[PDB]
Copies of this chain bind each other. A is one copy, B any other.
Amino acid sequence: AIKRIGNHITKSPEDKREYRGLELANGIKVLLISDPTTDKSSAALDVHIGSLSDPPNIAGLSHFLEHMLFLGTKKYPKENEYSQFLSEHAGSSNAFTSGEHTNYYFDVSHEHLEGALDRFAQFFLSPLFDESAKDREVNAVDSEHEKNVMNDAWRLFQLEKATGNPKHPFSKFGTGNKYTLETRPNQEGIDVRQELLKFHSAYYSSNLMAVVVLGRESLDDLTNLVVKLFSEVENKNVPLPEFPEHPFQEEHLKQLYKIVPIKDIRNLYVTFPIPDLQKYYKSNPGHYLGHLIGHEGPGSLLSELKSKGWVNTLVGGQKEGARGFMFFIINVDLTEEGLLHVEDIILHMFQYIQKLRAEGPQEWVFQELKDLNAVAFRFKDKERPRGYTSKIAGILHYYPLEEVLTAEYLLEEFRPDLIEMVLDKLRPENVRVAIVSKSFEGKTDRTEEWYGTQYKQEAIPDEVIKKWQNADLNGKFKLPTKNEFIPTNFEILPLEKEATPYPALIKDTAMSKLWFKQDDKFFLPKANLNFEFFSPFAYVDPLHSNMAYLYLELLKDSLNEYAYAAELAGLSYDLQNTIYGMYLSVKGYNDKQPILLKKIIEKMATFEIDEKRFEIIKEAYMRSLNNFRAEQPHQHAMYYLRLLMTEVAWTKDELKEALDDVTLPRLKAFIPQLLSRLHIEALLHGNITKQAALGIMQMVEDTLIEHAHTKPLLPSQLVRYREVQLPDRGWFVYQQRNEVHNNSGIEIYYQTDMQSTSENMFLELFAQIISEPAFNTLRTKEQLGYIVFSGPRRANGIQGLRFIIQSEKPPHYLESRVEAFLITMEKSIEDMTEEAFQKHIQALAIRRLDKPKKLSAESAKYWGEIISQQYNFDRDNTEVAYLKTLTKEDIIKFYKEMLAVDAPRRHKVSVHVLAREPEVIQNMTEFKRGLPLFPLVKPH
């Protein structure tokens, strides 16, 4: 069925990838991506037969088929063979299934597309779905359900799927566990495999593909190479799975629901099933809804609710649904005092609806957000070869081949009818209410079938109905104003005399230190900024750390309602604290980061306090403190890891106790004492000059001395924390008991050495050569537990080696199998040939040598050196040049004194994180009391 129809494609002229769409006569839509500049080529295939076309008795038949359609052909019937061919050419494929799609996508090393096409063609001629791949892949799907046990959003999602019409095919179960996929059909004698063959043969083989290939080959060779190759798909005219009715048919409308959550949250969830705008993608009022409903601005609803203290956060907007119907969701966070006023919150919601009803549609919002679509559509930076092709193949089904790239970022018409229409869909007739609160006890009986969440209707009384009906009024509400942060500075400045691949010290004082580099590679109008604010007062107490948290948090939170317009313009930022000081990040365009950032410095320099806001944030961090008894035991192990291996550390227990005495006058007194004398360090990167960067820095510290009279710090009180020396041979351990999880954790740590050129290679190559056999033996073969991790630990200028495994075991028993794996790797050193060595050092080589893809990525790497103050900018080529000087026999010399069991320089320490039910380590103070301390690193 070799059919092709195409022409010139509107291709958003920043990309150079020339495009062409065509449709094959067996229901295969073909979009051609030609990138002769890509390192890795990619391809994607979306079948519009989704998981709504599954049989009602067997869950995840399309899910298990798109898992199983890879493995087993008449060419290659072996179990991992297709995947082993993707292990040859470095490609990491994945595929998925939705209600209206079942989608495939894959990449490849450089040009080996054909090889995967040869592995791919006999999927349509003869899919096999054999015994063993099936019986392990069902364990993979059951593990997928097992890891989605504790994700409550899928529980509530399925709760939306099941509390509609349970007869409607929307109400089916998407993934399917062990029990539904293979326990119930074969006890009913239904072969899952014959269903697979039926499903693929009738449904998949017929029609509804949407293929797209990111190839490097040409426009034409891959074209008449794959067009010709797909006539094995034969049209049978299977109809498109659509729904002519929504499952919400007034049984669950004008209804309340009360949900008991697994996580300690407070939420209210409102859903509106709404008619189709799939034909109305052109004007697309749902984008207008997402702009207007979730705006946080002058006279907005969230501004008043923060001013009323009822709402912490919200999200709302259009949720897509079936071909016929669509959804409209509202998901808000709840405070304490929202509980008596829940209905009043809903009243304010109807007030905002009436505010939109009062002023009707708006046109300058439509044209302005259209222009924002224009700007963001042009200034698309790059594209991932994975995921992008799966997305545009997702919309290749619904959109013409020239409209796939102008997907939603261009708007033709203005539809005040549709906007008023969905406002007519926002009425008390149309409301669904789902309340998320922990307090629901003994009262929510009706339990979910698959996962088990529990709810109750408690239909709305008439007082609230009539209050919903009559009260369509205005309160605070105003329409929001135009943003002011729109840039015009898009002009790339050519590189000057500062022609460096690494940021140079353009300014150093005793107050500041300023490193700078322009965008050599990426050539973007944006710029990224990193800031170190050093302070003595940071980790003096639990109290001061609490004051750092609360201060920075409520501080950033204050001008956040103003910041919504800043993030609305495309300018992101970060405020962070450290044990050493404060961290500031500024990312975005060149426009008003001086103006706005100066306004930020002036804001946090001279700042005021609300009384009850202070109490809520106080309680909130108190909540996070009480929360700290309940998290995942690997986080618990990393907490002890970074606890013991620093110089001083305040525990979360005494942090929890210390909030009994944190008063507002004490903080408010501390702040100018804090700000009186401190150090600032800054990294600047992007489309600017050096002298303008000097003027911005001069602005910033001028502002600082102007408001709070910042003085520099003494280079004897410019300190870092060291790391604990051990007596070179001991293996010490202790235990900690978990409360929540029945699994036990454990972590083993190695004091190797500073980051020298030798030790980086030693540790990286030894870790990577024990990385994949650990995956093969320990997790795959030994099946100890799902959370098994190994690897490095770079801290305080000292390398380290760490291992994270949680399971329910005796910990010394678990250590015994760890040591068994250590002996296995120990002999596997001696089992290394030259070839294993060479392929591994090539693996390490490509692991190390990889260009950045973002200014923030390389700024994060450089900043990661700056926080260690090392500046060894060409450690990459130095260490790689060193890497070729290593042998296998070298690492025995690394193994024997440092790593072996008889090793005299073995620096080994373990920590047990026991389930819910050497020498011991009783006192961490007495631990550090008679141990030496490491020296620090000479900075390059």
Q: A residues within 8 Å of B by Cβ?
A: 536-537, 540-541, 648-651, 654, 661, 666, 669, 673, 676, 714-719, 722, 725, 923-926, 929-938
Contact = CB atoms under 8 A, between A and B. Distances in A.
Contacts of A714: 654
Contacts of A933: 722, 725, 932-933
A716 B925 contact: yes
Contact of A540 (B536, B676, B934): B536
Contact of A715 (B673, B717, B925, B930): B925
Contacts of A654: 714, 716
Identical chains bound together, number: 2
A536 B658 CA distance: 15
Contacts of A923: 715
Contacts of A661: 676
A930 B937 contact: yes
A924 B716 CA distance: 8
A923 B939 CA distance: 14
B935 A929 contact: yes
Contact of A925 (B540, B718, B929, B932): B718
Contacts of A650: 716
Contact of A935 (B673, B931, B936, B938): B931
A938 B932 contact: no
A719 B715 CA distance: 23
Contact of A669 (B651, B669, B718, B931): B669
Nearest to A660: B711
A625 to B, nearest CB: 16
A673 B666 CA distance: 9
Nearest to A714: B654
A932 B929 contact: no
Contacts of A926: 938
Given A648-B719, A666-B673, A929-B936, 19 more contacts: A540-B540, A541-B717, A648-B716, A649-B716, A651-B716, A654-B714, A654-B716, A669-B669, A715-B923, A715-B925, A716-B924, A716-B925, A725-B932, A929-B938, A930-B936, A930-B938, A932-B933, A932-B935, A933-B933
A84 to B, nearest CB: 48
A936 B673 CA distance: 33
19 contacts: A536-B540, A541-B717, A650-B716, A661-B676, A666-B673, A669-B669, A715-B923, A715-B925, A718-B925, A722-B933, A725-B932, A929-B935, A929-B936, A930-B935, A930-B936, A930-B937, A930-B938, A931-B935, A932-B932
A705 to B, nearest CB: 14
Contacts of A666: 673
Contacts of A651: 716
Nearest to A673: B666
Q: Which of A649, A725, A923, A937 has the most CB of B within 10 A?
A: A725
Q: Which of A654, A718, A929 has the most CB of B within 10 A?
A: A929
A651 B673 CA distance: 22
A649 B719 CA distance: 12
A403 B650 CA distance: 69
Contacts of A540: 536-537, 540
A679 to B, nearest CB: 14
Contacts of A932: 725, 932-935
Q: List the 7 closest pairs (A to B, CB-CB), nearest first.
A: A933-B933, A930-B935, A929-B936, A930-B938, A716-B925, A932-B935, A931-B935
A751 to B, nearest CB: 13
Nearest to A923: B715
A111 B429 CA distance: 117
Nearest to A754: B930
A670 to B, nearest CB: 8
Contacts of A669: 669
Nearest to A934: B932
Nearest to A725: B932
Nearest to A665: B669
A722 to B, nearest CB: 7
Nearest to A716: B925
A541 B924 CA distance: 27
A661 B923 CA distance: 40
A924 B718 CA distance: 12
A632 B520 CA distance: 60
Q: Which of A536, A654, A716 has the most CB of B within 10 A?
A: A716
Contacts of A676: 661
A673 B924 CA distance: 27
Contacts of A725: 932-933
A163 to B, nearest CB: 50
A861 to B, nearest CB: 24
A535 to B, nearest CB: 12
A542 to B, nearest CB: 8
Nearest to A717: B541
A648 B926 CA distance: 21
A599 to B, nearest CB: 28
Contacts of A541: 536, 717
A63 to B, nearest CB: 51
A717 B541 CA distance: 8
Contacts of A649: 716
A541 B926 CA distance: 26
A481 B905 CA distance: 75
A201 B537 CA distance: 78
Nearest to A649: B716
Contacts of A938: 926, 929-930
A54 B469 CA distance: 122
A537 B673 CA distance: 14
A36 B661 CA distance: 66
A717 B937 CA distance: 26
Contacts of A536: 540-541
Nearest to A711: B661
A665 to B, nearest CB: 10
Nearest to A543: B677
A937 B673 CA distance: 36
A537 to B, nearest CB: 8
Nearest to A727: B935
A725 B648 CA distance: 19
A673 B670 CA distance: 10
Q: Which of A649, A669, A714, A725 has the most CB of B within 10 A?
A: A714
Contacts of A924: 716
A933 B669 CA distance: 36
A181 to B, nearest CB: 52
Nearest to A930: B935
A590 to B, nearest CB: 38
A924 B714 CA distance: 12
A932 B930 CA distance: 13
A618 B923 CA distance: 43
Q: Which of A536, A715, A924, A935 has the most CB of B within 10 A?
A: A935
A648 B650 CA distance: 21
Nearest to A936: B929
A628 B162 CA distance: 82
A685 to B, nearest CB: 28
Q: Which of A536, A673, A923 has the most CB of B within 10 A?
A: A673
A649 to B, nearest CB: 7
Contacts of A929: 935-936, 938
A726 B932 CA distance: 12
Contacts of A935: 929-932
A669 B670 CA distance: 10
Contacts of A719: 648
A661 B717 CA distance: 18
